[PDB]
Amino acid sequence: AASGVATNTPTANDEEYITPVTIGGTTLNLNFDTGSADLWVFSTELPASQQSGHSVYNPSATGKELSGYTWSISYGDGSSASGNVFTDSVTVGGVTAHGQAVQAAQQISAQFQQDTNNDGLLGLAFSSINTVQPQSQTTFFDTVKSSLAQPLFAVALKHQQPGVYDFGFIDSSKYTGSLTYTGVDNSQGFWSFNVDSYTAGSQSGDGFSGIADTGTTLLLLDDSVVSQYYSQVSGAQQDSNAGGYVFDCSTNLPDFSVSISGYTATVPGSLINYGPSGDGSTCLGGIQSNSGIGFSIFGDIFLKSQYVVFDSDGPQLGFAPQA
Amino acid sequence: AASGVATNTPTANDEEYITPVTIGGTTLNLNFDTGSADLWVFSTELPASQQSGHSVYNPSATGKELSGYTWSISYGDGSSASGNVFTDSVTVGGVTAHGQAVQAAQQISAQFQQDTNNDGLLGLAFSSINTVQPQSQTTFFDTVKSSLAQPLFAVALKHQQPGVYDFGFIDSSKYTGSLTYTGVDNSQGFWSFNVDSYTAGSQSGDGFSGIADTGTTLLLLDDSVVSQYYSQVSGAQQDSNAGGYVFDCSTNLPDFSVSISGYTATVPGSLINYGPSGDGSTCLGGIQSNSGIGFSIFGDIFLKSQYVVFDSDGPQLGFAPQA
Numbered sequence: 001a002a003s004g005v006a007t008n009t010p011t012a013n014d015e016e017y018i019t020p021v022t023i024g025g026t027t028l029n030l031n032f033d034t035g036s037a038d039l040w041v042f043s044t045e046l047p048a049s050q051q052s053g054h055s056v057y058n059p060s061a062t063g064k065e066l067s068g069y070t071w072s073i074s075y076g077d078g079s080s081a082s083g084n085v086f087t088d089s090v091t092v093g094g095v096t097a098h099g100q101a102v103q104a105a106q107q108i109s110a111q112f113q114q115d116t117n118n119d120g121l122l123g124l125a126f127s128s129i130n131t132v133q134p135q136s137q138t139t140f141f142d143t144v145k146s147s148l149a150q151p152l153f154a155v156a157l158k159h160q161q162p163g164v165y166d167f168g169f170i171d172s173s174k175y176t177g178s179l180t181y182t183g184v185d186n187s188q189g190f191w192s193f194n195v196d197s198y199t200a201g202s203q204s205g206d207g208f209s210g211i212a213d214t215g216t217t218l219l220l221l222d223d224s225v226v227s228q229y230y231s232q233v234s235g236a237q238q239d240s241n242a243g244g245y246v247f248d249c250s251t252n253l254p255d256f257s258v259s260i261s262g263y264t265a266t267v268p269g270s271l272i273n274y275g276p277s278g279d280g281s282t283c284l285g286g287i288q289s290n291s292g293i294g295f296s297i298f299g300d301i302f303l304k305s306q307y308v309v310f311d312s313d314g315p316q317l318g319f320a321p322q323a
Numbered sequence: 324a325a326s327g328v329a330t331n332t333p334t335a336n337d338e339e340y341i342t343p344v345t346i347g348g349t350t351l352n353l354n355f356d357t358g359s360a361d362l363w364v365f366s367t368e369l370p371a372s373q374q375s376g377h378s379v380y381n382p383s384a385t386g387k388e389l390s391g392y393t394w395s396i397s398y399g400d401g402s403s404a405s406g407n408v409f410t411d412s413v414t415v416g417g418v419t420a421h422g423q424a425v426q427a428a429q430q431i432s433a434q435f436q437q438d439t440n441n442d443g444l445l446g447l448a449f450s451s452i453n454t455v456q457p458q459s460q461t462t463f464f465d466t467v468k469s470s471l472a473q474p475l476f477a478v479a480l481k482h483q484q485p486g487v488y489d490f491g492f493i494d495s496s497k498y499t500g501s502l503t504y505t506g507v508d509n510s511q512g513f514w515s516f517n518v519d520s521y522t523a524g525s526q527s528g529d530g531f532s533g534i535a536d537t538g539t540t541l542l543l544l545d546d547s548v549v550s551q552y553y554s555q556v557s558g559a560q561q562d563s564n565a566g567g568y569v570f571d572c573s574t575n576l577p578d579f580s581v582s583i584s585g586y587t588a589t590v591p592g593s594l595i596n597y598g599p600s601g602d603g604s605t606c607l608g609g610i611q612s613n614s615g616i617g618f619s620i621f622g623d624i625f626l627k628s629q630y631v632v633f634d635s636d637g638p639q640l641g642f643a644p645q646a
């Protein structure tokens with residue numbers, strides 16, 4: 001049976017986490033994203049100017065083209081990408097998926113043209129939301145799932161330190177205590193789960209649902225919760241230049257926690273200080289608005305505090321504090 | 324209980340079929356498409372130059388915006404469209420869906436900018452393939468399905484004559500004999516079905532699967548079948564200006580038929596003559612290649628010969644020769 005460990009590394013301010021992935025013999029640095037189901041990469045089909053500062057996949061060398069197939073994806077921040085499709089060998093942490101569908105980019109929006117830290121995204125949400133037309137493809141995980149020792153993957157994202165993606169096994173040395181599991185609603189293709197309640201510093205409130213999403217940097221919550229949280233931060237104010245609420249970097253931030261099937265997941269205030277706002281001398285808050293979409297996004301700010309197991313059996317998510 | 328009848332009308336050469344749909348009090352002419360799951364319309368959000376020669380939806384007047392929601396779709400011919408989302412009242416043939424998600428176009432590719440015959444598309448494939456992010460919406464049919472007398476719709480597309488879309492009931496006067504049903508595989512979101520065999524003129528061959536797709540003008544089949552068919556047409560030759568095989572307009576074309584759960588669906592040779600190729604004095608064939616995608620597209624050329632029932636119970640498709 002198979003299993004493997006892929007090491008991830010955060011970019012400046014933990015804005016994103018990259019992990020090497022070898023496709024058809026070429027190694028690219030991809031952003032693993034549990035919030036989407038497409039594996040797409042910068043390729044030789046892009047204009048040469050857009051290939052600069054990236055490792056690119058050349059489909060002609062090793063891929064098998066799916067004639068007539070296309071893909072087109074649009075993300076939460078409005079970014080987008082589209083292209084054609086090939087199958088090829090894809091290796092991650094020593095685990096190889098043969099015949100994996102690789103989505104070669106032909107067009108990418110400005111956000112991606114500006115980000116030279118990654119060469120594409122590897123989706124780990126459920127395959128039901130893969131965008132390939134006319135017939136959707138399976139994610140790397142769904143492709144290899146049956147070959148793994150256990151049909152799950154786990155992740156430990158860290159603050160300014162390398163972390164890991166464990167495929168097909170759980171590394172108990174990565175967390176304290178035992179794991180607590182909760183049921184996943186995969187109906188919209190996400191690793192969605194419910195929280196029973198939350199505590200923002202001195203204020204507690206009713207539960208809500210949200211998605212475990214490695215692809216989003218911040219912890220995005222309803223406007224009412226964000227207000228409650230920042231009302232407790234002296235001098236907090238919104239700064240559109242920075243992207244949300246900002247505050248003096250030395251401010252003492254309250255903790256934030258959620259109750260999940262009896263387990264209290266706590267994000268300490270120190271992790272809620274994302275980093276310099278870029279806006280002179282303030283810091284950007286790790287908690288920001290979800291724009292009224294009706295569910296919360298448990299992004300990297302939250303994930304940095306926990307070891308999280310994504311188990312296809314159930315499905316269900318397991319949580320424990322990182323070691 | 325509800326039911327209704329919407330009249331469709333073919334454009335020149337039966338290239339597409341339009342049907343009026345009233346959204347928030349404004350009537351638009353839409354192309355009903357059983358091959359996709361999005362209801363999208365030309366809107367006031369498009370550049371004014373692109374609104375010309377169309378009836379447009381103004382979301383601000385009656386729609387409720389789903390903040391943070393987007394849609395982006397890519398079709399078989401490579402065309403595409405994208406925009407934002409609103410809920411509104413949508414009436415088709417006297418049947419009203421309240422709170423139906425209407426996808427307002429913000430960008431559309433050249434194919435749509437050139438086609439002034441329609442103001443958008445109304446998808447009737449399964450809702451599982453609807454493109455709305457972050458949470459997909461239901462098609463008009465799935466929205467109203469529970470209110471209908473029977474959870475089905477039926478269609479009779481005609482050659483140069485008005486036809487109908489029957490919602491929630493079957494009009495037995497539209498076909499000869501009794502209906503034959505066959506099981507539908509909705510796993511890729513299409514009204515997919517299997518045929519046991521086919522007969523192209525003097526040649527017969529093994530079965531294959533395909534989708535019932537009102538949104539595609541032609542009958543698209545595997546290259547091997549297309550070759551077999553045209554090898555029997557004197558003087559047939561490909562003409563890229565025209566889009567495929569063309570032949571002298573007076574040529575006697577062989578029939579084409581498929582066996583489906585014991586029923587023989589026959590497309591007479593006269594319907595296989597699509598119309599002038601635009602390429603001087605030849606006619607375009609109604610049968611053309613599917614580009615190697617692995618399944619056939621039973622488009623309008625085929626549908627013009629049958630009354631077809633799309634039944635959500637099963638699901639299953641019913642067929643009988645048009646009356």
Ligand SMILES: COC(=O)[C@H](Cc1ccccc1)OP(=O)([O-])[C@H](Cc1ccc2ccccc2c1)NC(=O)[C@@H](NC=O)C(C)C
Nearest residue numbers: 033035036075076077079111115213215216217218456457
């Ligand atoms: C269709 O669902 C998505 O796009 C999922 C889920 C989702 C849905 C709605 C709102 C937020 C997130 O996001 P993702 O796949 O993790 C998606 C992945 C993504 C998108 C653009 C990128 C641009 C450059 C580099 C990495 C990128 C990663 N991240 C984001 O869109 C967010 N960006 C950052 O936090 C916005 C929320 C702030």
Ligand SMILES: COC(=O)[C@H](Cc1ccccc1)OP(=O)([O-])[C@H](Cc1ccc2ccccc2c1)NC(=O)[C@@H](NC=O)C(C)C
Nearest residue numbers: 133134356358359398399400402434438536538539540541
């Ligand atoms: C994602 O699936 C589709 O796009 C489905 C199914 C499909 C898949 C693969 C190949 C062909 C068809 O096609 P549709 O929704 O019926 C799709 C609907 C469609 C697309 C563009 C249009 C542009 C102008 C006006 C009407 C349009 C209708 N039609 C077509 O793309 C075809 N166009 C014509 O036959 C190409 C095949 C010739």
Ligand SMILES: *[C@H]1O[C@H](CO)[C@@H](O)[C@H](O)[C@@H]1O
Nearest residue numbers: 001002003004149168169
């Ligand atoms: C992950 O687990 C597999 C299956 O037990 C091992 O073979 C591998 O070495 C790694 O420990």
Ligand SMILES: *[C@H]1O[C@H](CO)[C@@H](O)[C@H](O)[C@@H]1O
Nearest residue numbers: 005006007008162163164
């Ligand atoms: C990535 O690198 C980490 C340490 O930097 C290892 O723990 C892991 O096995 C992988 O090689």
Ligand SMILES: *[C@H]1O[C@H](CO)[C@@H](O)[C@H](O)[C@@H]1O
Nearest residue numbers: 324325326327472491492
């Ligand atoms: C369609 O069927 C409904 C339900 O029987 C009728 O009320 C309607 O008039 C139409 O015949």
Ligand SMILES: *[C@H]1O[C@H](CO)[C@@H](O)[C@H](O)[C@@H]1O
Nearest residue numbers: 328329330331485486487
């Ligand atoms: C559309 O028009 C047809 C005839 O043109 C009617 O049969 C149908 O009821 C609808 O009014």
